[PDB]
Each structure stands twice: as structure tokens, then as C-alpha cells.
Ligand SMILES: [Zn+2]
């Protein structure tokens with residue numbers, strides 16, 4: 679676990695998952711690339727989609 683780094687790039691991240699406020703990324707593309715994997719642990723905080 680790096681200090682404020684992109685979950686994919688490994689360099690640096692500025693954006694944060696708006697759905698869980700946890701995941702961090704440097705861009706929209708990075709979020710989409712990891713998004714597929716992200717759904718494995720995302721969507722279990724608010725529980726709206728059901
Ligand atoms: Zn990135």
C-alpha cells in the first residue's frame with residue numbers, strides 16, 4: 679500500500695472512488711480499468727443497487 683498512489687499506475691493518484699470514497703486513481707480510464715476488479719469489493723458500503 680503506497681502513500682497516495684494510483685491503484686494501477688503505482689506512481690500517483692488524485693481521484694477517489696465516488697461510490698466508496700476509498701479507491702484512488704489518477705484518471706477516468708484508470709478507474710475503468712480497475713473498475714472491473716473494483717466491483718469485487720465495491721458496492722458493500724451503502725447497498726443501493728441491491
Ligand atoms: Zn493511474
Ligand SMILES: [Zn+2]
Pocket residue numbers: 695696697698699700701716720721
Ligand atoms: Zn469503489
